[PDB]
Design an enzyme around this catalytic site. Structure first.
Site, PDB file in Angstrom:
ATOM      1  N   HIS A  20       0.791  -1.131  -0.048  1.00  0.00           N
ATOM      2  CA  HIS A  20       0.082   0.059   0.063  1.00  0.00           C
ATOM      3  C   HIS A  20       0.921   1.384  -0.031  1.00  0.00           C
ATOM      4  O   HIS A  20       0.445   2.402  -0.052  1.00  0.00           O
ATOM      5  CB  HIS A  20      -1.076  -0.077   1.293  1.00  0.00           C
ATOM      6  CG  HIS A  20      -0.529   0.596   2.301  1.00  0.00           C
ATOM      7  ND1 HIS A  20      -0.194  -0.423   3.474  1.00  0.00           N
ATOM      8  CD2 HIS A  20      -0.396   1.701   3.130  1.00  0.00           C
ATOM      9  CE1 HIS A  20       0.315   0.512   4.504  1.00  0.00           C
ATOM     10  NE2 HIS A  20       0.119   1.411   4.332  1.00  0.00           N
ATOM     11  N   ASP A  77      -0.297  -7.360   1.761  1.00  0.00           N
ATOM     12  CA  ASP A  77       0.173  -6.126   1.800  1.00  0.00           C
ATOM     13  C   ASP A  77       1.526  -6.090   1.945  1.00  0.00           C
ATOM     14  O   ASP A  77       2.162  -5.681   3.052  1.00  0.00           O
ATOM     15  CB  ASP A  77      -0.405  -5.182   3.098  1.00  0.00           C
ATOM     16  CG  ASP A  77      -0.146  -3.828   2.954  1.00  0.00           C
ATOM     17  OD1 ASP A  77      -0.115  -3.282   1.761  1.00  0.00           O
ATOM     18  OD2 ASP A  77      -0.275  -3.074   3.819  1.00  0.00           O
ATOM     19  N   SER A 107       4.372   2.430   8.553  1.00  0.00           N
ATOM     20  CA  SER A 107       4.071   1.462   7.560  1.00  0.00           C
ATOM     21  C   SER A 107       5.060   1.085   6.631  1.00  0.00           C
ATOM     22  O   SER A 107       5.953   1.708   6.232  1.00  0.00           O
ATOM     23  CB  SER A 107       2.757   1.933   6.667  1.00  0.00           C
ATOM     24  OG  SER A 107       1.472   1.970   7.431  1.00  0.00           O
ATOM     25  N   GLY A 108       5.288  -0.271   6.471  1.00  0.00           N
ATOM     26  CA  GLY A 108       6.126  -0.861   5.496  1.00  0.00           C
ATOM     27  C   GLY A 108       7.574  -1.065   6.383  1.00  0.00           C
ATOM     28  O   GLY A 108       8.398  -1.706   5.908  1.00  0.00           O
TER      29      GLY A 108
END
Ligand SMILES: *[C@@H]1O[C@H](CO)[C@@H](O)[C@H](O)[C@H]1NC(C)=O
Length: 223
Positions: free
Chosen positions: A41, A86, A178-179
């Protein structure tokens, strides 16, 4: 990162960051001299990768261009309600200088076990819901939750490729993290994917993409 503190400079050598100019998009993980792992994402049509950073206002640090963005095939760019698969591998335009301050993480073959103590880190907001972005990399201790405690927290949204983690004192990943990495005993167990709003609620833990489920796909793509 909530309820944590500034990490020891370069103590998380694999920590990467996805940037769009001087704008932090997501966190990342170095898995090879030419590869960075993140959440699917996080994909943008144009962005660079920074490694070896501690402070964002500062020779370990490097900024490399992106050659290719490879989302997991089963990920659906439409329907962001679905957080399944994801995960994404980024092929770097140029090789990264490896050293003691910039090196790839070891991917976990064995899945995470309930209770395991791990470390989450990133340049994401330090408070929630109020946005307060730190200048230095933050670190926090989190624990692997049970799948049933994970499922009750997010009815019908948890798949076998996800794992919840958190802390009784509210340690959690949040906006901008995120990530990034979920590291337990020196190994990459997860990629921070999604969570609740606001972050830092023990009953509403952060969800991570379980690495053990995707190690096959990961290697096949690099080799
Ligand atoms: C997600 O992708 C699938 C692929 O078959 C598609 O059928 C579905 O409609 C997509 N989700 C949404 C909300 O469009």
């Amino acid at each position: 990162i909530l309820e944590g503190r500034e990490c020891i400079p370069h103590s998380q050598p694999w920590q990467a960051a996805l940037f769009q100019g001087e704008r932090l998009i997501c966190g990342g993980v170095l898995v090879g001299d030419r590869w960075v792992l993140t959440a699917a994402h996080c994909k943008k049509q144009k962005y660079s990768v920074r490694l070896g950073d501690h402070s964002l206002q500062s020779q370990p640090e490097q900024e490399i261009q992106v050659a290719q963005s490879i989302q997991h095939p089963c990920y659906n760019n439409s329907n962001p309600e679905d957080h399944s698969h994801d995960i994404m591998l980024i092929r770097l335009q140029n090789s990264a200088n490896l050293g003691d301050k910039v090196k790839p993480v070891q991917l976990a073959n064995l899945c995470p076990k309930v209770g395991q103590k791990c470390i989450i880190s990133g340049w994401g907001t330090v408070t929630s819901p109020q946005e307060n972005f730190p200048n230095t990399l933050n670190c926090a201790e989190v624990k692997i939750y049970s799948q049933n405690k994970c499922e009750r927290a997010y009815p019908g949204k948890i798949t076998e490729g996800m794992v919840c983690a958190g802390s009784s004192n509210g340690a959690d990943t949040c906006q901008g993290d995120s990530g990034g990495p979920l590291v337990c005993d020196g190994m990459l167990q997860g990629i921070t994917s999604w969570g609740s709003d606001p972050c830092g609620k023990p009953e509403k833990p952060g969800v991570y993409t379980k690495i053990c489920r995707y190690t096959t796909w990961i290697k096949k793509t690099m080799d």
